[model samples]
Target: MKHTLPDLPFDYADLEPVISHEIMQLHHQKNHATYVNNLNQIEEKLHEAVSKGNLKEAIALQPALKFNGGGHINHSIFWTNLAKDGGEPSKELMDTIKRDFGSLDNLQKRLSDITIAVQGSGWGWLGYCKKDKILKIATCANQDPLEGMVPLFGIDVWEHAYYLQYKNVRPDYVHAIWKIANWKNISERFANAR
Candidate 1:
């Protein structure tokens, strides 16, 4: 099936001061949509390349596939990761955070720190380490998805995500994002991953 841009769970303004409506609209309608479009185009070309035995062209498509594919996936999850009336984490998720990071505050701090420290465009994620049955904080540069882990929540540190409102102050944008996080969505993801 061809990839499509998923609708946001809430209104663009729902995130409010945390994430402005303009940013949300542009990010979803333009940025993410572009990725979806590109991914579909790339897939078609890739199929044609394989059918025509064009090994070089097929191999050259790898970077675009990963970038556009990851962008589609990351933005899809990102939309669900936020809400206007954000709620606290579920008991199961809370217990896991406490067990793994000693407390929720610590986890937030660590995740925030890692996200803000990303040298360039990337993402900071709270992912489940299935091998160890523990939660882990990870960062991926560019359009790299969180592999080998189940992503519960992700913060996009790309310039387009925060540049309009926060300008050059990425830390401020990252710091404010937590306020609108949809912990309920994250908790459910954790439960399902387990």
Candidate 2:
């Protein structure tokens, strides 16, 4: 399926000084948009190769689709994952949070630490293990999405996400991000995914 760049829920300046307007402009308009365009282009050729029964071309096209599709999916989740005023996690989620991580303070600290320490371009996620009905902290390299568990929240540690403002200290950006955590969207996602 084709994907499009999703718009931010807040104004460019709304997330500052937690995040920067400049980064959001570039992230939403240029970075994410490029993935959408490339994904569209790749899908067309992949489809054509399949219709013509060109097995070699279709196999060659797989990696391009994986990268662009993962980029499109990851970024879509990233935007909805932030807010100017996201409020607190819902009461329903609190019980599970305690059950899994013992406390909200612990979850934030652990997830934030893991995200900041990501080796390179990647994402840290708070994912829900469906079968176990438990939550876990997970990390994925580059634009890879979390597997084995459903992603409840994701932190983008890529340079494009924080470098322009937070500079080289990624920890600063990770710590500040909790201020804008979109718990409302997160809670809904939790319930729906559950």
Candidate 3:
């Protein structure tokens, strides 16, 4: 099946003061749309390569497939992970947060610190490790997806995600995004992962 851009769960302006309307629109309509289109294009070729028994070509497609497919998957979850006047985490999620990171604030601090410290375009993620029933924080470079765990929350740290409004200050952008994070959405993800 062809991948397509997922619609934003809330209006562009809904995340204002944290994420600007223009940024949200461009990020969704352009950046994410590009990823979806590229993913579909590559997948079509990948299918052809496999059908023709061209193993080399099929193997060569892995990087693009992972990058664009990861982009599509990450952005789909990301839109839902934000909202207007988004509420706090569910009680269960909070208990998990406390167990893992001491408190919600500590979790935020740790995630933010890791996200801001990413050397290049990447994402900061809070993921659930089902095997251990533990919460983990991780960073993925470029459009890489969270692996070895189920992603609960992610913050885009690419320049396109924040540069226009925040200038060169990625830390500020990462910190500001916390205000609009839809913890309820994250909690649901956590529940399902568990």
Best candidate, TM-score: 3
lDDT of 1: 0.93
CA error at residue 55 for candidate 1, angstroms? 2.2
lDDT of residue 86 for candidate 3: 79
Candidate 3 residue pairs in backbone clash: none
Better of 1 and 3 by TM-score: 3
Write one digit per residue (lDDT tens) for candidate 2, span 58-137. 99998888888888989899899999988989998888999899999999999998898899899999988889989899
For model 3, residues 6-93, the per-residue Cα lDDT tens digits are 8888888888889999999999999999999999999999999999999999999999999999999889989989988779899999
How does model 3 score by TM-score? Answer: 0.98
Clashing residue pairs, backbone N/CA/C < 3 A, model 1? none
TM-score for candidate 1, residues paired by index: 0.98
Mark the 10 consecutive residues where model 2 has the least summed lDDT.
1-10
lDDT of 3 at 188: 92
